[PDB]
Amino acid sequence: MERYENLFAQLNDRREGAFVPFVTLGDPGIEQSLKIIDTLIDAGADALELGVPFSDPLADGPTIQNANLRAFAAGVTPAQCFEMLALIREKHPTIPIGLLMYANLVFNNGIDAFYARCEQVGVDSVLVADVPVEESAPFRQAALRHNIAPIFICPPNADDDLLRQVASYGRGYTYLLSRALPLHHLIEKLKEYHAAPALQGFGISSPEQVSAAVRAGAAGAISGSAIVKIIEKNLASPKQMLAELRSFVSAMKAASRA
Amino acid sequence: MERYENLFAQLNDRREGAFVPFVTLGDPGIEQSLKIIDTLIDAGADALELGVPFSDPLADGPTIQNANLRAFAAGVTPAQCFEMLALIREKHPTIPIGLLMYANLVFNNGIDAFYARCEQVGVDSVLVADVPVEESAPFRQAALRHNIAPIFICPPNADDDLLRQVASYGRGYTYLLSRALPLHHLIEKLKEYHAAPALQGFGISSPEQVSAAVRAGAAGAISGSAIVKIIEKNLASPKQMLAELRSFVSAMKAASRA
Amino acid sequence: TTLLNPYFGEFGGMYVPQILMPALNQLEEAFVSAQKDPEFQAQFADLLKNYAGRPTALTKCQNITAGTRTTLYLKREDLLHGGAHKTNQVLGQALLAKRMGKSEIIAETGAGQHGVASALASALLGLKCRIYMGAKDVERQSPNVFRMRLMGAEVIPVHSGSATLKDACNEALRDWSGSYETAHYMLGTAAGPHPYPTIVREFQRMIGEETKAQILDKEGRLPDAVIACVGGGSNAIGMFADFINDTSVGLIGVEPGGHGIETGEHGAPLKHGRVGIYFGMKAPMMQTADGQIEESYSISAGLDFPSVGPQHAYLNSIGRADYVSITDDEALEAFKTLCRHEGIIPALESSHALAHALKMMREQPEKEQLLVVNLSGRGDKDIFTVHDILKARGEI
Amino acid sequence: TTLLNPYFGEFGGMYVPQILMPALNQLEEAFVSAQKDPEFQAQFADLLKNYAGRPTALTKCQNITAGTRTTLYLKREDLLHGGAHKTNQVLGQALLAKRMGKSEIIAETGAGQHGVASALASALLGLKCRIYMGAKDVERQSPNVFRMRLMGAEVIPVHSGSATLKDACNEALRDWSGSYETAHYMLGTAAGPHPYPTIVREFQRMIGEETKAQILDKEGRLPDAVIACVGGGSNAIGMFADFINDTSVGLIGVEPGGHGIETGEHGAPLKHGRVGIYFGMKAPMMQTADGQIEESYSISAGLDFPSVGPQHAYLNSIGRADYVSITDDEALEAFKTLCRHEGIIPALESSHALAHALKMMREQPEKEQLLVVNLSGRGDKDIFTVHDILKARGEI
């Protein structure tokens, strides 16, 4: 989680928002995924959110449902995802790496052992998509024992009890979905409760949405599916895929800058 | 009915049984049926039983179910059957002609009118296959008013009440089905009750069965389906049909003779 | 001679060959005795309740009548074991067979619904069941044939004559004329020779008896009318029987109008045939001018009979019951309406009764009326028929 | 926080994205209130009785047990409107939707039986019903799709991901995460996140309550065991619930053994899977060594789920209920046996429960035992499946 602290301190001294792309590990295969991720970083990604392909991803929209299927079609396994994560960290020492997991892949061989493996490969945070704060105790405990930030979603239908729990239990960043209390109010209240810095994760597909998120008082933006749409769009030309990813991330990052 | 009286008186003076073939009128068409019937008479038939094709002949075995269908296939109607009957009588003045009818064809345009038409064309008897003695009143009344003998079946499951009713209500002949009181008993009891003379109608397909019927005390035998089997068998060679019918009827009639 | 009058006024009788009269007399005797026998009545009640699921619900249908002064109830014979009212009387006739010491059931079927009902009663009560079926029908009806054989019934293909229903019925009655000491002929409707119209009514009369008790409990009065479809007449006489002496209650029977009475392609002999004698009875039938029995037609196999039970002809003649017709298109619209507005898929047979009730409501929507439709069966069996007609007219 | 414990021992919980927790809390609240509300209970009772046909018969099956010391009763959920027990709880959940002021029902189906149940409840109660269906399933299931659309439900083909059940379920829950102010997600089994396992049990518990009253009336004692098939667990927990505190009564749940446990082609996670977290709950599931959810298999679509309700996992863990498996071949023999010896065509799902009762009898035929099988549904829907297997093994 220390990587996120260091990042946000550095961005705050530059009066700068974070831009954080999401991709599915191994979409559309392992080698092209490694090149995609290096291209996202070279283009100016401040941190990464990375998904592990799962048989039954009930929490993802169609674009990510189809990324998951391509990664399965390539036969990508959790063990291969953890080999990929070690290689990414070994190349890039400071960039915060966050995982987007489903509970079964975390619980499968022991919750503690899962977070121990995260720590060994140099993961900084884990968002478990189907674990609400009400069920989070053993996940957040294992996370913290292995120096992993547990990431919580603050949804548009949050109440005061949920803002206080998310503020208390989260580390690294708060995943804000302003998909319903105003945006202003949620960001203000999270800050009042000393929450982890907020990243806006709803509908971030253009530069103007990144600037709007920073202007609203968020620490940055997560592009939850627009990066994956650019992969889906360019499967036939890997080289064009990497060029469109670089020009998209460059533009989104420029929008975060003072 | 007087034709039957005269026939049985003549046969009794010759110590002789009656042989009576059955055919469906218009099987396999009208002209071949007229030739079949003339061939049955020239061969020695003592009387005829003639069926009128009906849509739903629930009382007939398969051989006659199929004769009925051929006669329909030729488009044979009740009106054409009555034209055929007038032509048969006009050719053969003394031979008793009996009809085998279904109740609907008798009831259709009025029971009385049906028996009036029978009398006009020179029919001597009518057996209505689906009218038991319990339902027979208007049929037997209309029959007798038009000088038509009403023919009743005396089945193998007859009791004393049924023998007395058949004996009382019938004219012309009693149609005996010895398909259960002994044959001896039924013939003896019908004679005791002054019934119309008995014709054995069960399973008469060979000469020995005609002699057995006469030996048992019956006035004769009816061949209910064996004549129709010879038509079914020879449909492709009308000339052979008539030759096999003549040699079959000749043999069956010879068996009735003293 | 009989114990009971074989006629309803001028209609009914026993128009069978002499050889079958002892079988009909034996059955009449057994029935009259059984009707006096508390043990028979207790066994029948036990099968109706614990095996078939009686009593059947009486469903008030609010969505379909909203904005009118019609209150409509459905008597739910569709919920009976087997999914139609036929089950009631095959259980009673199977108990009568056992009363007479028989071990065998004979029946015939075209479409297969009476054959399935006969076979389920025979399997329950340990009777050997043979069901005569036209070879051309065996070909058409693989699912009903499969259900019958699953239930251990021997399904006999009949190739004789036209290889169809009338040919299967001929074979069945031929067998019965020889086998009646050990075999009972289980007639599937309130028609045929005495005593079948009487027996079938008495073994269906719980439909109306329950409906009366349920309507009195729910509404505190009798219905203005009870409405039933009429194929041979069993579900209708079963609904009607207990109301006959309640002269304020309308009795409405609905025959199949097919493509329209004016086309000649219908199954409405009671109102559009003329009296004849066939299948053991004097009754209205569809016939040619020269007295051949015509072929009926209906979208619904269960209603497609060119005659009708004699008690219906009698009730019509004296003006106690009124008979109407409903076309294929009217029945299809009622079928769709019940599916969409009540979540019940009715048999196309029953849809004729519902279509006439919908007509009574729609024609006179400010008329206060309390109607019961006899929902004689469920329509699972009809979804391919309905599917094919709807796709073939552009989903209309 | 919740009003009720979301867990049965270590099993159950609410493993959903945060955005769905208010929807689950709202539903829990409405359910707890409804359970206190005599008007809710009276409306539910009215629909169960007058629309669905409760109470369902309890049938003693004499032919199938003759010569043994087994007495076997069948609880006849096959006679319920819709032809399976699913109807009970969709009526209750549709009333809960109306309690919460919703006008819309969401569901998904693969085989189509829960979608038909959802659509009939929605048509009766005037709810707009949308049912998400895999495009590959829409292709397979023309009759269930037709029944759903006949009943006015909008059937939405899902082409996303693998175009199947899990893809239809994803779309359904995505819709619900946005629509839950106006739409109720009608979960078809006693599984998923709290409060669904609780609600579905309480809305099926009349199965066991009736069975207890009927067995006491008929036999003067409780059953030695009650036996039910387990797909997600609703019919089984509905039979079990009222006997849980009768510790002399055996509770036996039967999972589908498919081609044989040893093949891996089965639907028996409770005894042959291992605990995981998916579909909102911590429960036994079939999974790969690395925690992907496996595909189950059964001849019977209704049992073909790679998980199970958490209350069953809990009852098993403490030794209150015992779970077994029955193979495709054992279920098929029970299906044939019931057809031939009782004239009842069981659902292939229910045939698994009957097959285990037949095993209990046949293994120990001199053991005195009083067994109830929950006959969860009718098998009309299964005759083509059974037909195809029987012809393909030379009528064996």
Ligand SMILES: *Cc1c(COP(=O)(O)O)cnc(C)c1O
């Ligand atoms: C058999 C059948 C009928 C027609 O027969 P009736 O003897 O006239 O009642 C009607 N509805 C259903 C559902 C049937 O199965």
Ligand SMILES: *Cc1c(COP(=O)(O)O)cnc(C)c1O
């Ligand atoms: C749906 C179904 C089942 C399986 O579901 P459960 O929730 O396990 O009861 C079993 N039997 C029938 C007939 C069904 O329709």
Ligand SMILES: N=C(N)[C@@H](/N=N/c1ccccc1)C(N)=O
């Ligand atoms: N909506 C989701 N993505 C989650 N499913 N949530 C469910 C909500 C209600 C019933 C069943 C499941 C999940 N990940 O389990």
Ligand SMILES: N=C(N)[C@@H](/N=N/c1ccccc1)C(N)=O
């Ligand atoms: N057996 C026959 N040939 C007669 N049919 N007889 C029947 C006997 C019982 C029920 C229905 C009909 C007839 N001709 O109507």
Ligand SMILES: [Cl-]
């Ligand atoms: Cl994989």
Ligand SMILES: [Cl-]
């Ligand atoms: Cl770095």
Ligand SMILES: [Cl-]
């Ligand atoms: Cl997410």
Ligand SMILES: [Cl-]
């Ligand atoms: Cl807190």
Ligand SMILES: [Cl-]
């Ligand atoms: Cl914090």
Ligand SMILES: [Cl-]
């Ligand atoms: Cl994301």
Ligand SMILES: [Cl-]
């Ligand atoms: Cl003709």
Ligand SMILES: [Cl-]
């Ligand atoms: Cl002459």
Ligand SMILES: [Cl-]
């Ligand atoms: Cl004859």
Ligand SMILES: [Cl-]
């Ligand atoms: Cl006399």
Ligand SMILES: [Cl-]
């Ligand atoms: Cl005389």
Ligand SMILES: [Cl-]
């Ligand atoms: Cl003859």
